[PDB]
PDB file of C-alpha atoms and ligand atoms in Angstrom:
ATOM      1  CA  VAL G  23       3.951  22.636   5.980  1.00  0.00           C
ATOM      2  CA  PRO G  24       6.602  22.700   3.244  1.00  0.00           C
ATOM      3  CA  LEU G  25       5.843  21.108  -0.097  1.00  0.00           C
ATOM      4  CA  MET G  26       8.248  18.375  -1.192  1.00  0.00           C
ATOM      5  CA  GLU G  27       8.731  18.069  -4.954  1.00  0.00           C
ATOM      6  CA  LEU G  28       9.330  14.527  -6.172  1.00  0.00           C
ATOM      7  CA  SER G  29       8.429  14.572  -9.868  1.00  0.00           C
ATOM      8  CA  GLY G  30      11.782  14.680 -11.592  1.00  0.00           C
ATOM      9  CA  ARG G  31      13.882  13.985  -8.505  1.00  0.00           C
ATOM     10  CA  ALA G  32      12.694  10.514  -7.477  1.00  0.00           C
ATOM     11  CA  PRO G  33      14.129   7.482  -9.301  1.00  0.00           C
ATOM     12  CA  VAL G  34      12.284   6.504 -12.488  1.00  0.00           C
ATOM     13  CA  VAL G  35      10.856   2.965 -12.641  1.00  0.00           C
ATOM     14  CA  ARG G  36       9.334   2.043 -16.014  1.00  0.00           C
ATOM     15  CA  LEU G  37       6.271  -0.185 -16.251  1.00  0.00           C
ATOM     16  CA  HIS G  38       7.916  -2.715 -18.599  1.00  0.00           C
ATOM     17  CA  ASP G  39      11.312  -2.760 -16.836  1.00  0.00           C
ATOM     18  CA  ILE G  40      10.238  -2.831 -13.199  1.00  0.00           C
ATOM     19  CA  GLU G  41      12.751  -5.351 -11.847  1.00  0.00           C
ATOM     20  CA  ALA G  42      15.719  -3.769 -13.638  1.00  0.00           C
ATOM     21  CA  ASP G  43      14.746  -0.196 -12.809  1.00  0.00           C
ATOM     22  CA  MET G  44      14.204  -1.047  -9.120  1.00  0.00           C
ATOM     23  CA  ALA G  45      17.676  -2.592  -8.983  1.00  0.00           C
ATOM     24  CA  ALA G  46      19.127   0.642 -10.398  1.00  0.00           C
ATOM     25  CA  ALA G  47      17.049   2.669  -7.904  1.00  0.00           C
ATOM     26  CA  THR G  48      18.169   0.604  -4.911  1.00  0.00           C
ATOM     27  CA  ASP G  49      20.701   3.052  -3.479  1.00  0.00           C
ATOM     28  CA  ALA G  50      18.425   6.057  -3.997  1.00  0.00           C
ATOM     29  CA  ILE G  51      15.572   4.205  -2.254  1.00  0.00           C
ATOM     30  CA  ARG G  52      17.738   3.197   0.715  1.00  0.00           C
ATOM     31  CA  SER G  53      18.814   6.822   1.125  1.00  0.00           C
ATOM     32  CA  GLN G  54      15.167   7.936   1.159  1.00  0.00           C
ATOM     33  CA  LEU G  55      14.323   5.487   3.937  1.00  0.00           C
ATOM     34  CA  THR G  56      17.417   6.565   5.898  1.00  0.00           C
ATOM     35  CA  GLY G  57      16.928  10.272   5.246  1.00  0.00           C
ATOM     36  CA  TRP G  58      13.126  10.719   5.217  1.00  0.00           C
ATOM     37  CA  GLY G  59      11.445   7.649   6.741  1.00  0.00           C
ATOM     38  CA  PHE G  60       9.466   6.844   3.583  1.00  0.00           C
ATOM     39  CA  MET G  61      10.350   6.003  -0.028  1.00  0.00           C
ATOM     40  CA  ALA G  62       9.316   7.205  -3.481  1.00  0.00           C
ATOM     41  CA  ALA G  63       9.601   6.342  -7.171  1.00  0.00           C
ATOM     42  CA  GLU G  64       8.226   7.873 -10.369  1.00  0.00           C
ATOM     43  CA  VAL G  65       6.425   5.316 -12.562  1.00  0.00           C
ATOM     44  CA  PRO G  66       5.606   6.851 -15.974  1.00  0.00           C
ATOM     45  CA  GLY G  67       2.027   6.091 -16.952  1.00  0.00           C
ATOM     46  CA  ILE G  68       0.833   5.025 -13.482  1.00  0.00           C
ATOM     47  CA  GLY G  69      -1.098   8.241 -12.902  1.00  0.00           C
ATOM     48  CA  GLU G  70      -3.174   7.740 -16.062  1.00  0.00           C
ATOM     49  CA  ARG G  71      -4.329   4.303 -14.857  1.00  0.00           C
ATOM     50  CA  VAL G  72      -4.926   5.365 -11.237  1.00  0.00           C
ATOM     51  CA  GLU G  73      -6.994   8.433 -12.163  1.00  0.00           C
ATOM     52  CA  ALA G  74      -9.136   6.335 -14.507  1.00  0.00           C
ATOM     53  CA  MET G  75      -9.605   3.739 -11.742  1.00  0.00           C
ATOM     54  CA  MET G  76     -10.539   6.368  -9.152  1.00  0.00           C
ATOM     55  CA  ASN G  77     -12.970   8.199 -11.437  1.00  0.00           C
ATOM     56  CA  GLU G  78     -14.681   4.918 -12.322  1.00  0.00           C
ATOM     57  CA  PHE G  79     -14.930   4.099  -8.611  1.00  0.00           C
ATOM     58  CA  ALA G  80     -16.557   7.520  -8.030  1.00  0.00           C
ATOM     59  CA  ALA G  81     -19.144   6.804 -10.739  1.00  0.00           C
ATOM     60  CA  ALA G  82     -19.797   3.335  -9.318  1.00  0.00           C
ATOM     61  CA  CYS G  83     -20.363   4.921  -5.885  1.00  0.00           C
ATOM     62  CA  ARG G  84     -23.345   6.808  -7.358  1.00  0.00           C
ATOM     63  CA  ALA G  85     -24.741   3.918  -9.423  1.00  0.00           C
ATOM     64  CA  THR G  86     -27.916   1.869  -8.741  1.00  0.00           C
ATOM     65  CA  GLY G  87     -28.256  -0.734 -11.658  1.00  0.00           C
ATOM     66  CA  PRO G  88     -26.454  -2.958  -9.265  1.00  0.00           C
ATOM     67  CA  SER G  89     -25.181  -0.743  -6.334  1.00  0.00           C
ATOM     68  CA  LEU G  90     -21.743  -1.025  -4.710  1.00  0.00           C
ATOM     69  CA  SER G  91     -23.536  -1.597  -1.417  1.00  0.00           C
ATOM     70  CA  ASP G  92     -24.793  -4.888  -2.916  1.00  0.00           C
ATOM     71  CA  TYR G  93     -21.147  -5.932  -2.250  1.00  0.00           C
ATOM     72  CA  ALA G  94     -20.772  -4.471   1.228  1.00  0.00           C
ATOM     73  CA  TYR G  95     -18.370  -6.559   3.280  1.00  0.00           C
ATOM     74  CA  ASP G  96     -21.146  -8.187   5.284  1.00  0.00           C
ATOM     75  CA  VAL G  97     -22.787  -9.732   2.178  1.00  0.00           C
ATOM     76  CA  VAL G  98     -19.535 -10.684   0.369  1.00  0.00           C
ATOM     77  CA  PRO G  99     -18.054 -14.156   1.061  1.00  0.00           C
ATOM     78  CA  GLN G 100     -14.982 -13.731   3.275  1.00  0.00           C
ATOM     79  CA  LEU G 101     -11.949 -15.933   3.835  1.00  0.00           C
ATOM     80  CA  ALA G 102     -11.993 -18.091   6.954  1.00  0.00           C
ATOM     81  CA  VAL G 103      -8.542 -16.701   7.855  1.00  0.00           C
ATOM     82  CA  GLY G 104      -7.790 -13.155   6.802  1.00  0.00           C
ATOM     83  CA  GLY G 105      -8.976  -9.594   6.659  1.00  0.00           C
ATOM     84  CA  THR G 106     -12.302  -8.351   5.342  1.00  0.00           C
ATOM     85  CA  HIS G 107     -12.707  -7.422   1.663  1.00  0.00           C
ATOM     86  CA  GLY G 108     -15.554  -5.726  -0.196  1.00  0.00           C
ATOM     87  CA  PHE G 109     -17.280  -2.356  -0.001  1.00  0.00           C
ATOM     88  CA  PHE G 110     -17.547  -0.221   3.162  1.00  0.00           C
ATOM     89  CA  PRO G 111     -20.518   2.180   2.937  1.00  0.00           C
ATOM     90  CA  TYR G 112     -20.444   5.608   4.561  1.00  0.00           C
ATOM     91  CA  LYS G 127     -15.520   7.912   4.045  1.00  0.00           C
ATOM     92  CA  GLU G 128     -16.776   5.275   1.586  1.00  0.00           C
ATOM     93  CA  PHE G 129     -14.200   2.808   0.294  1.00  0.00           C
ATOM     94  CA  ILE G 130     -13.555  -0.670  -1.106  1.00  0.00           C
ATOM     95  CA  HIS G 131     -10.932  -3.257  -0.277  1.00  0.00           C
ATOM     96  CA  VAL G 132     -10.008  -5.299  -3.348  1.00  0.00           C
ATOM     97  CA  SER G 133      -7.964  -8.220  -2.032  1.00  0.00           C
ATOM     98  CA  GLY G 134      -5.737 -10.510  -4.045  1.00  0.00           C
ATOM     99  CA  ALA G 135      -8.177 -13.261  -3.025  1.00  0.00           C
ATOM    100  CA  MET G 136     -11.105 -11.269  -4.449  1.00  0.00           C
ATOM    101  CA  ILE G 137      -9.287 -10.852  -7.818  1.00  0.00           C
ATOM    102  CA  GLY G 138      -9.066 -14.679  -8.011  1.00  0.00           C
ATOM    103  CA  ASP G 139     -12.738 -15.158  -6.932  1.00  0.00           C
ATOM    104  CA  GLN G 140     -11.894 -16.605  -3.477  1.00  0.00           C
ATOM    105  CA  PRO G 142     -16.122 -18.117  -4.804  1.00  0.00           C
ATOM    106  CA  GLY G 143     -18.478 -15.105  -5.278  1.00  0.00           C
ATOM    107  CA  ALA G 144     -15.986 -12.644  -3.710  1.00  0.00           C
ATOM    108  CA  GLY G 145     -15.193 -11.594  -7.256  1.00  0.00           C
ATOM    109  CA  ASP G 146     -18.782 -10.571  -7.992  1.00  0.00           C
ATOM    110  CA  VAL G 147     -18.237  -6.871  -7.234  1.00  0.00           C
ATOM    111  CA  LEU G 148     -15.619  -6.801 -10.026  1.00  0.00           C
ATOM    112  CA  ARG G 149     -18.018  -8.593 -12.399  1.00  0.00           C
ATOM    113  CA  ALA G 150     -20.724  -6.067 -11.465  1.00  0.00           C
ATOM    114  CA  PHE G 151     -18.439  -3.049 -12.099  1.00  0.00           C
ATOM    115  CA  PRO G 152     -15.964  -4.484 -14.616  1.00  0.00           C
ATOM    116  CA  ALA G 153     -14.615  -1.202 -15.989  1.00  0.00           C
ATOM    117  CA  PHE G 154     -13.516  -0.194 -12.483  1.00  0.00           C
ATOM    118  CA  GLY G 155     -12.685  -3.806 -11.652  1.00  0.00           C
ATOM    119  CA  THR G 156     -10.345  -4.259 -14.620  1.00  0.00           C
ATOM    120  CA  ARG G 157      -8.448  -1.069 -13.725  1.00  0.00           C
ATOM    121  CA  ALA G 158      -8.310  -2.136 -10.066  1.00  0.00           C
ATOM    122  CA  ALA G 159      -6.836  -5.533 -10.948  1.00  0.00           C
ATOM    123  CA  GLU G 160      -4.324  -3.821 -13.260  1.00  0.00           C
ATOM    124  CA  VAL G 161      -3.276  -1.303 -10.583  1.00  0.00           C
ATOM    125  CA  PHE G 162      -3.169  -4.054  -7.918  1.00  0.00           C
ATOM    126  CA  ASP G 163      -0.752  -6.110 -10.037  1.00  0.00           C
ATOM    127  CA  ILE G 164       1.579  -3.174 -10.768  1.00  0.00           C
ATOM    128  CA  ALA G 165       1.478  -2.060  -7.135  1.00  0.00           C
ATOM    129  CA  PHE G 166       2.140  -5.566  -5.815  1.00  0.00           C
ATOM    130  CA  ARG G 167       5.185  -5.995  -8.072  1.00  0.00           C
ATOM    131  CA  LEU G 168       6.573  -2.608  -7.050  1.00  0.00           C
ATOM    132  CA  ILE G 169       5.955  -3.062  -3.334  1.00  0.00           C
ATOM    133  CA  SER G 170       7.573  -6.516  -3.309  1.00  0.00           C
ATOM    134  CA  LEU G 171      10.722  -4.969  -4.789  1.00  0.00           C
ATOM    135  CA  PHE G 172      10.575  -2.152  -2.211  1.00  0.00           C
ATOM    136  CA  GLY G 173      10.525  -4.910   0.415  1.00  0.00           C
ATOM    137  CA  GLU G 174      13.638  -6.471  -1.112  1.00  0.00           C
ATOM    138  CA  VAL G 175      15.353  -3.076  -0.841  1.00  0.00           C
ATOM    139  CA  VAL G 176      14.405  -2.790   2.837  1.00  0.00           C
ATOM    140  CA  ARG G 177      15.450  -6.389   3.465  1.00  0.00           C
ATOM    141  CA  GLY G 178      18.860  -5.622   1.939  1.00  0.00           C
ATOM    142  CA  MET G 179      19.334  -2.900   4.544  1.00  0.00           C
ATOM    143  CA  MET G 180      18.661  -5.369   7.386  1.00  0.00           C
ATOM    144  CA  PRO G 181      21.308  -7.644   8.976  1.00  0.00           C
ATOM    145  CA  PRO G 182      22.559 -10.758   7.168  1.00  0.00           C
ATOM    146  CA  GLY G 183      20.227 -13.718   7.522  1.00  0.00           C
ATOM    147  CA  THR G 184      17.066 -11.572   7.434  1.00  0.00           C
ATOM    148  CA  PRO G 185      14.280 -13.731   5.914  1.00  0.00           C
ATOM    149  CA  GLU G 186      12.388 -12.693   2.795  1.00  0.00           C
ATOM    150  CA  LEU G 187       9.305 -10.592   3.693  1.00  0.00           C
ATOM    151  CA  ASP G 188       7.076 -13.238   2.007  1.00  0.00           C
ATOM    152  CA  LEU G 189       4.293 -10.771   1.102  1.00  0.00           C
ATOM    153  CA  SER G 190       1.110 -12.686   0.225  1.00  0.00           C
ATOM    154  CA  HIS G 191      -0.805 -11.895  -2.962  1.00  0.00           C
ATOM    155  CA  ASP G 192      -4.151 -13.050  -1.535  1.00  0.00           C
ATOM    156  CA  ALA G 193      -3.768 -11.279   1.840  1.00  0.00           C
ATOM    157  CA  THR G 194      -2.715  -7.969   0.242  1.00  0.00           C
ATOM    158  CA  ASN G 195      -5.419  -5.505  -0.626  1.00  0.00           C
ATOM    159  CA  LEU G 196      -5.967  -2.400  -2.720  1.00  0.00           C
ATOM    160  CA  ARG G 197      -8.093   0.217  -0.948  1.00  0.00           C
ATOM    161  CA  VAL G 198      -9.854   2.843  -3.070  1.00  0.00           C
ATOM    162  CA  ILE G 199     -11.472   5.732  -1.080  1.00  0.00           C
ATOM    163  CA  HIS G 200     -14.161   8.245  -2.182  1.00  0.00           C
ATOM    164  CA  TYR G 201     -14.491  11.170   0.299  1.00  0.00           C
ATOM    165  CA  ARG G 202     -11.014  11.220   1.936  1.00  0.00           C
ATOM    166  CA  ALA G 212      -5.311  12.219  11.949  1.00  0.00           C
ATOM    167  CA  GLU G 213      -1.764  10.914  12.132  1.00  0.00           C
ATOM    168  CA  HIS G 214      -1.367   7.155  11.828  1.00  0.00           C
ATOM    169  CA  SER G 215       0.523   4.293  10.246  1.00  0.00           C
ATOM    170  CA  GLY G 216      -0.471   1.028   8.648  1.00  0.00           C
ATOM    171  CA  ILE G 217      -0.512  -2.148  10.704  1.00  0.00           C
ATOM    172  CA  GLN G 218       0.857  -4.264   7.851  1.00  0.00           C
ATOM    173  CA  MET G 219       4.354  -4.768   6.379  1.00  0.00           C
ATOM    174  CA  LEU G 220       4.370  -2.112   3.636  1.00  0.00           C
ATOM    175  CA  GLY G 221       1.979   0.326   2.011  1.00  0.00           C
ATOM    176  CA  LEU G 222       2.152   1.857  -1.461  1.00  0.00           C
ATOM    177  CA  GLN G 223       0.404   5.209  -1.795  1.00  0.00           C
ATOM    178  CA  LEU G 224      -0.722   5.775  -5.368  1.00  0.00           C
ATOM    179  CA  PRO G 225      -1.107   9.364  -6.647  1.00  0.00           C
ATOM    180  CA  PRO G 226      -4.307  10.785  -5.132  1.00  0.00           C
ATOM    181  CA  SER G 227      -6.751  13.152  -6.800  1.00  0.00           C
ATOM    182  CA  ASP G 228      -5.851  16.104  -4.537  1.00  0.00           C
ATOM    183  CA  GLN G 229      -3.014  17.374  -2.374  1.00  0.00           C
ATOM    184  CA  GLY G 230      -3.228  16.987   1.377  1.00  0.00           C
ATOM    185  CA  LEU G 231      -1.379  13.829   2.373  1.00  0.00           C
ATOM    186  CA  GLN G 232       1.535  14.717   4.673  1.00  0.00           C
ATOM    187  CA  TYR G 233       4.406  12.745   6.246  1.00  0.00           C
ATOM    188  CA  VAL G 234       6.492  13.300   9.370  1.00  0.00           C
ATOM    189  CA  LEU G 235      10.277  13.380   8.992  1.00  0.00           C
ATOM    190  CA  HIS G 236      12.874  11.919  11.337  1.00  0.00           C
ATOM    191  CA  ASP G 237      13.217  15.362  12.954  1.00  0.00           C
ATOM    192  CA  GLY G 238       9.506  15.422  13.863  1.00  0.00           C
ATOM    193  CA  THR G 239       8.521  18.103  11.337  1.00  0.00           C
ATOM    194  CA  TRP G 240       5.940  17.492   8.602  1.00  0.00           C
ATOM    195  CA  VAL G 241       6.204  17.675   4.792  1.00  0.00           C
ATOM    196  CA  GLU G 242       3.621  17.486   1.991  1.00  0.00           C
ATOM    197  CA  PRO G 243       4.774  15.363  -0.978  1.00  0.00           C
ATOM    198  CA  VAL G 244       3.628  16.819  -4.309  1.00  0.00           C
ATOM    199  CA  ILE G 245       1.873  13.734  -5.682  1.00  0.00           C
ATOM    200  CA  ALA G 246      -1.669  14.627  -6.814  1.00  0.00           C
ATOM    201  CA  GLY G 247      -1.957  14.157 -10.563  1.00  0.00           C
ATOM    202  CA  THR G 248       1.661  12.864 -10.826  1.00  0.00           C
ATOM    203  CA  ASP G 249       3.250   9.499 -11.631  1.00  0.00           C
ATOM    204  CA  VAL G 250       4.879   9.351  -8.171  1.00  0.00           C
ATOM    205  CA  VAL G 251       4.150   6.498  -5.747  1.00  0.00           C
ATOM    206  CA  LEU G 252       5.228   6.480  -2.083  1.00  0.00           C
ATOM    207  CA  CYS G 253       6.194   3.362  -0.125  1.00  0.00           C
ATOM    208  CA  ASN G 254       5.296   3.325   3.606  1.00  0.00           C
ATOM    209  CA  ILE G 255       6.901   1.266   6.353  1.00  0.00           C
ATOM    210  CA  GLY G 256       4.134  -0.515   8.259  1.00  0.00           C
ATOM    211  CA  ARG G 257       4.146  -1.616  11.881  1.00  0.00           C
ATOM    212  CA  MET G 258       4.754  -5.312  11.088  1.00  0.00           C
ATOM    213  CA  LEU G 259       8.053  -4.281   9.488  1.00  0.00           C
ATOM    214  CA  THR G 260       8.876  -1.988  12.411  1.00  0.00           C
ATOM    215  CA  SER G 261       8.445  -5.081  14.602  1.00  0.00           C
ATOM    216  CA  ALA G 262      10.330  -7.449  12.272  1.00  0.00           C
ATOM    217  CA  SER G 263      13.230  -4.976  12.138  1.00  0.00           C
ATOM    218  CA  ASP G 264      13.066  -4.499  15.962  1.00  0.00           C
ATOM    219  CA  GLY G 265      12.557  -0.716  15.707  1.00  0.00           C
ATOM    220  CA  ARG G 266      15.212  -0.005  13.065  1.00  0.00           C
ATOM    221  CA  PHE G 267      12.604   1.398  10.664  1.00  0.00           C
ATOM    222  CA  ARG G 268       9.835   3.428  12.276  1.00  0.00           C
ATOM    223  CA  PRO G 269       6.377   3.317  10.647  1.00  0.00           C
ATOM    224  CA  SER G 270       5.964   5.935   7.898  1.00  0.00           C
ATOM    225  CA  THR G 271       3.455   7.922   9.958  1.00  0.00           C
ATOM    226  CA  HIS G 272       1.261  10.226   7.853  1.00  0.00           C
ATOM    227  CA  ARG G 273      -1.941  12.295   7.964  1.00  0.00           C
ATOM    228  CA  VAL G 274      -4.385  13.963   5.554  1.00  0.00           C
ATOM    229  CA  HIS G 275      -4.964  17.730   5.828  1.00  0.00           C
ATOM    230  CA  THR G 276      -7.597  18.941   3.304  1.00  0.00           C
ATOM    231  CA  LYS G 277      -8.694  22.503   2.389  1.00  0.00           C
ATOM    232  CA  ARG G 285     -11.354  13.923  -3.441  1.00  0.00           C
ATOM    233  CA  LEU G 286     -10.325  10.248  -4.016  1.00  0.00           C
ATOM    234  CA  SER G 287      -7.237   8.189  -2.974  1.00  0.00           C
ATOM    235  CA  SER G 288      -5.950   4.610  -3.359  1.00  0.00           C
ATOM    236  CA  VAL G 289      -3.303   2.638  -1.470  1.00  0.00           C
ATOM    237  CA  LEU G 290      -2.003  -0.939  -1.493  1.00  0.00           C
ATOM    238  CA  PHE G 291      -1.651  -2.585   1.941  1.00  0.00           C
ATOM    239  CA  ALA G 292       0.792  -5.522   1.678  1.00  0.00           C
ATOM    240  CA  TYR G 293       0.537  -8.346   4.262  1.00  0.00           C
ATOM    241  CA  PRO G 294       2.398 -11.623   4.777  1.00  0.00           C
ATOM    242  CA  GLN G 295       0.427 -14.826   5.296  1.00  0.00           C
ATOM    243  CA  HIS G 296      -1.722 -14.466   8.425  1.00  0.00           C
ATOM    244  CA  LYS G 297      -0.973 -18.011   9.645  1.00  0.00           C
ATOM    245  CA  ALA G 298       2.790 -17.614   9.222  1.00  0.00           C
ATOM    246  CA  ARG G 299       4.955 -17.260  12.324  1.00  0.00           C
ATOM    247  CA  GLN G 300       6.296 -13.846  13.250  1.00  0.00           C
ATOM    248  CA  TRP G 301      10.021 -13.262  13.154  1.00  0.00           C
ATOM    249  CA  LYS G 302      12.263 -10.553  14.526  1.00  0.00           C
ATOM    250  CA  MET G 303      15.904  -9.579  13.914  1.00  0.00           C
ATOM    251  CA  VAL G 304      17.155  -8.799  17.434  1.00  0.00           C
ATOM    252  CA  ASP G 305      20.747  -7.525  17.677  1.00  0.00           C
ATOM    253  CA  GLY G 306      21.710  -9.322  14.464  1.00  0.00           C
ATOM    254  CA  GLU G 307      20.101 -12.623  15.477  1.00  0.00           C
ATOM    255  CA  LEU G 308      16.987 -14.028  13.802  1.00  0.00           C
ATOM    256  CA  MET G 309      14.241 -15.031  16.250  1.00  0.00           C
ATOM    257  CA  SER G 310      11.220 -17.121  15.369  1.00  0.00           C
ATOM    258  CA  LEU G 311       8.230 -16.340  17.543  1.00  0.00           C
ATOM    259  CA  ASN G 312       5.279 -18.528  18.460  1.00  0.00           C
ATOM    260  CA  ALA G 313       2.808 -15.786  17.531  1.00  0.00           C
ATOM    261  CA  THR G 314       1.583 -15.472  13.936  1.00  0.00           C
ATOM    262  CA  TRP G 315       1.160 -12.370  11.808  1.00  0.00           C
ATOM    263  CA  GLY G 316      -2.575 -12.794  12.379  1.00  0.00           C
ATOM    264  CA  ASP G 317      -1.887 -12.551  16.113  1.00  0.00           C
ATOM    265  CA  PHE G 318      -0.022  -9.254  15.438  1.00  0.00           C
ATOM    266  CA  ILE G 319      -3.179  -7.693  13.871  1.00  0.00           C
ATOM    267  CA  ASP G 320      -5.360  -8.799  16.839  1.00  0.00           C
TER     268      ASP G 320
HETATM  269 CL1  LIG Y   1      -1.692   3.541   6.355  1.00  0.00          CL
HETATM  270 FE1  LIG Y   2      -2.741   5.756   5.778  1.00  0.00          FE
END
């Protein structure tokens, strides 16, 4: 599987100029989606924050003062409508939702229990959510006129951090792969062959098309199917619209509102 270098070739998006740098990167990003099936940007300083976050998660995974399993999903208060946040014991991982970051009450306790990790996770969540919303505006701009805004929801979006890790794609609208600790993540190209982005220990983030966006675009953009081939930590933002909101679909240039909700799509 060929390596794909991205450091130094992907568009640069600076942490304190995100909106302006993403506007400049728009054409490069569109050409990635058209030419590869996934997108990429280099964000100077992101790797520093993500590695710190991941290493603090690894330490928390071994801790007992309070243990992360004290915040396993089945003992964390969950939203009446939405996905499941909290810790998933053993390959062991945590979902930090936007709702959890705002304590929606007690859901925030895992971040109060591990505040060094939790502060980094909130920081990375916020950067990732700003970036991914601008990626969605790029993709929207490629879609026919009258395409609605993606309407990604802060509270329904979640940052997953994994501790010990076949081909698949995300169910949601978009994903943002942050630089993992090790190489091994691979993506399939439009020609059906696989590539391995060089991203471990870099400032490069990848943006994945999820299956909700494949549906909303009526097949125009296939999911950014990927797999992990190892020879070990990783984090990714999964961006969702509001679960109770009505699906829509651009069919042959016409906007269609459906009865089914985005929550129905997940089920
Ligand atoms: Cl995924
Ligand atoms: Fe994935």
